[PDB]
Amino acid sequence: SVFVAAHTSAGKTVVAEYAIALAQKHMTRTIYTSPIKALSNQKFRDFRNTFGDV
RNA sequence: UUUUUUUUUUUUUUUUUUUUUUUUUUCUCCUCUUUUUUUUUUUU
């Protein structure tokens, strides 16, 4: 279990997409929670063309 | 000078069967009178 306290936004997302890529090697599922509508779809768009299905 | 968030119309389909109209009651029952019975025959 990891807690992160930093300042840059995308810098914290590296471990997030590390876990996301790690799930498909484990065949499990992951949930991403974004408590704002604009950011909720930006990560989906970022990871759609990047890999897999979101 | 009034921001931000609260998903939606149950899943399933590629199961066998070798009979035949109907169907099941009603009891014994005083017949009145000119008769033997006439008769061939011919014209259809």
Swiss-Prot record:
Which residues are the signal sequence here?
none
Q: Per UniProt, where does ATP bind?
A: A6, H7, T8, S9, A10, G11, K12, T13
Q: Where in the cell is it found?
A: Nucleus; Cytoplasm
Instruction: Report the superkingdom from the record.
Output: Eukaryota
Per its database record, what is this protein's job?
Helicase component of the SKI complex, a multiprotein complex that assists the RNA-degrading exosome during the mRNA decay and quality-control pathways. The SKI complex catalyzes mRNA extraction from 80S ribosomal complexes in the 3'-5' direction and channels mRNA to the cytosolic exosome for degradation. SKI-mediated extraction of mRNA from stalled ribosomes allow binding of the Pelota-HBS1L complex and subsequent ribosome disassembly by ABCE1 for ribosome recycling. In the nucleus, the SKI complex associates with transcriptionally active genes in a manner dependent on PAF1 complex (PAF1C).
Clinical disorder: Trichohepatoenteric syndrome 2: A syndrome characterized by intrauterine growth retardation, severe diarrhea in infancy requiring total parenteral nutrition, facial dysmorphism, immunodeficiency, and hair abnormalities, mostly trichorrhexis nodosa. Hepatic involvement contributes to the poor prognosis of affected patients.
Quaternary structure per UniProt?
Component of the SKI complex which consists of SKIC2, SKIC3 and SKIC8. Interacts with HBS1L isoform 2.
Could you say which protein family the record assigns here?
Belongs to the helicase family. SKI2 subfamily.
Record's protein name:
Superkiller complex protein 2
Q: Give the organism, scientific name.
A: Homo sapiens
Instruction: State which gene encodes it.
Output: SKIC2
Q: Which residues of the full protein are shown?
A: 327 to 380 of 1246
